[PDB]
Amino acid sequence: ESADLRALAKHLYDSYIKSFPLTKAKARAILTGKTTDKSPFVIYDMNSLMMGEDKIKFKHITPKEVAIRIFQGCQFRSVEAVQEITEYAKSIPGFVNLDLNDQVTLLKYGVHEIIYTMLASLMNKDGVLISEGQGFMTREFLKSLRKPFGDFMEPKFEFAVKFNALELDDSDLAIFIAVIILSGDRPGLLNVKPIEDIQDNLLQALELQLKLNHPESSQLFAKLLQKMTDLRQIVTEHVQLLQVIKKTETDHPLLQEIYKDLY
Amino acid sequence: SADLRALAKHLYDSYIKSFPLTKAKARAILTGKTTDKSPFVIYDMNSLMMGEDKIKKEVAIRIFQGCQFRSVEAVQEITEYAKSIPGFVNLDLNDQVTLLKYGVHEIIYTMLASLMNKDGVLISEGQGFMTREFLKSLRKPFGDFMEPKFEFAVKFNALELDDSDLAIFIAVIILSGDRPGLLNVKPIEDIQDNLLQALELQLKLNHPESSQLFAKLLQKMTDLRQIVTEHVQLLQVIKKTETDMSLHPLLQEIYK
Ligand SMILES: Cc1c(C)n(Cc2ccc(Cl)c(OCC(=O)O)c2)c2ccc(C(=O)NCc3ccc(C(C)(C)C)cc3)cc12
Ligand SMILES: Cc1c(C)n(Cc2ccc(Cl)c(OCC(=O)O)c2)c2ccc(C(=O)NCc3ccc(C(C)(C)C)cc3)cc12
Termini Cα distance of chain B: 43
* Contacts across the A-B interface (CB distance below 8 Å): 38
**Pocket of ligand 2 from Cβ distances under 6 Å:** B 63, 66-68, 70-72, 74-75, 104-105, 108, 112, 115, 121, 123-124, 130, 231, 251, 254
Give A20's DSSP letter: -
Q: Judging by beta carbons within 10 Å of its beta carbon (0-12, 13-18, 19+), is residue B137 exposed, middle or buried? A: middle
| Cα gap A96→A144, rounded to integer Å | 44
3-state secondary structure of A263: coil
Residues 6+ apart with CB under 8 A from B25: B126
| B244 Ramachandran zone, left/alpha/beta (phi>0; psi -120 to 50) | beta
Q: Half-sphere exposure of residue A193, counting CA atoms within 13 Å on the CB side?
A: 2
Q: Which residues, listed in sequence order, are joined to residue A130 by a DSSP beta bridge? A: A135
Domain extents in chain A = 1-263
| Cα gap B67→A118, rounded to integer Å | 43
- Residue A122: CB atoms within 10 A of its CB come to 21
- Residue B243: CB atoms within 10 A of its CB come to 7
Mutation to test the A interface, candidates B204, B212, B226, most A Cβ within 10 Å: B212
Q: How was this structure determined?
A: X-ray
- Residue A44: CB atoms within 10 A of its CB come to 13
Q: Which residues, listed in sequence order, are joined to residue A247 by a DSSP beta bridge? A: none
Query: Could you tell me the sign of the dihedral formed by the alpha carbons of B223, B226, B231, B237, in that order?
Result: negative
- Residue A86: CB atoms within 10 A of its CB come to 15
Are A89 and A95 spatial neighbours (Cβ–Cβ below 8 Å)? yes
Helix, strand and coil percent figures for chain A, each rounded to 5: 65, 5, 30
**Cβ-Cβ contacts under 8 Å, A204 against chain B:** 211-212
Angle of CA points B47, B48, B49, to nearest 5°: 90
Q: What is the 3-class SS of A93-132, one letter each residue?
A: CCHHHCCHHHHHHHHHHHHHHHHHHHHHCCEECCEEEEHH
| Cα gap A231→B157, rounded to integer Å | 24
Give the torsion through C-alpha atoms of A178, A182, A185, A187, to 10 deg.
110
**Cβ-Cβ contacts under 8 Å, A227 against chain B:** none
What single letter denotes the amino acid at residue A221? F
List residues in chain A touching B: CB distance below 8 A. 162, 185, 199-200, 203-204, 218-219, 222-223, 225-226, 228-230, 232-233, 236
Q: What is the 3-class SS of chain B, one letter each residue?
A: CHHHHHHHHHHHHHHHHHCCCCHHHHHHHHHCCCCCCCCEEECCHHHHHHHHHHCCCCHHHHHHHHHHHHHHHHHHHHHHHHHCCCCHHHCCHHHHHHHHHHHHHHHHHHHHHHCEECCEEEEHHHCEEEEHHHHCCCCCCHHHCCHHHHHHHHHHHCCCCCHHHHHHHHHHHHCCCCCCCCCCHHHHHHHHHHHHHHHHHHHHHHCCCCCCHHHHHHCCHHHHHHHHHHHHHHHHHHHHHCCCCCCCHHHHCCCC
| Cα gap B127→A36, rounded to integer Å | 74
At how many Å resolution was this determined? 3.0
**Cβ-Cβ contacts under 8 Å, B198 against chain A:** none
Judge whether A75 is annotated as a binding position: yes
Are B195 and B87 spatial neighbours (Cβ–Cβ below 8 Å)? no
Termini Cα distance of chain A: 39
Q: Do B212 and A233 touch (CB under 8 A)?
A: no
What single letter denotes the amino acid at residue B1? S
